[PDB]
C-alpha cells in the first residue's frame, strides 16, 4: 500500500508548492508516481513503474496560455 | 514495488491530466499525488487516511497564482 518508497521519508507529508506563473517551460510535467529522479517534476519514470507493476499512473501537465 | 493507483480509470493505460494556467480560479489549488481523492485529479485530503493506514508520507502538489 506504500505509494512513496524513497522520497524525503523523514518528512511525514511531502507537499510541493509551485508558482505556476514562473513556468520556464511552455508545458511542464509534474510527477504523480513518486519515482521521478527530478521529483516533483516528471522524468518519464512512470513508464518503468507501469511496466514493472501493471499500473497506469502518469503526470500532471501544467501549460501556459 | 507494487500498484500506486487502485481504482481510478483502470481502463485507461496511462492517466495523464493537463491544467491550463488561465483555468485556475483560486490563488492556490491542490492536485492529488496519492490516487485516492474522490475529486481526482484535485486533492480532497484522502492522502491523510492513506498515510495513517500504510505509514506513507505522500501529499499534494499546490499550484500558486497571483
Ligand atoms: S516520473 Fe512520475 S509521473 Fe512521470
Ligand atoms: S487526496 Fe491525494 S494527495 Fe491529497
Residue numbers in the entry:
A (entry chain A): 69 to 133
B (entry chain B): 68 to 133
Publication text:
In the M1-NAF-1 structure, determined at 1.74 Å resolution, only one extra density of M1 molecule is present in between two NAF-1 homodimers. However, the structure of M1-NAF-1 indicates that M1 is unable to form a hydrogen bond with Lys95 (equivalent of Lys68 of mNT). Although mNT and NAF-1 share a high percentage of sequence and structure homology, NAF-1 possesses a glutamate residue at position 85 (not alanine as for mNT). Consequently, Lys95 is able to form a salt bridge with Glu85 (2.7 Å distance). A second important difference from the binding mode of furosemide to mNT is that the oxygen of the benzamide moiety of M1 molecule makes a hydrogen bond with mNT-Lys68 or shifts the position of NAF-1-Lys95. In the native protein, hydrogen bond formation between Lys55/Lys81 and His87/His114 (mNT/NAF-1), is critical for cluster stability with His87/His114 in effect performing a gatekeeper function which is compromised upon M1 binding to Lys55/Lys81 to result in higher lability of the bound clusters. Taken together the structures of M1-mNT/NAF-1 strongly suggest that in addition to His87/His114, interactions with Lys55/81 and cross-talk between the β-cap and the cluster binding area are also playing an important role in mNT and NAF-1 cluster lability/stability.
In humans, NEET proteins are represented by MiNT, localized inside the mitochondria, mitoNEET, and NAF-1, both anchored to the mitochondria outer membrane; with NAF-1 being also present on the surface of the endoplasmic reticulum and its mitochondria-associated membrane. NEET proteins harbor two [2Fe-2S] clusters with a unique 3Cys:1His coordination structure.
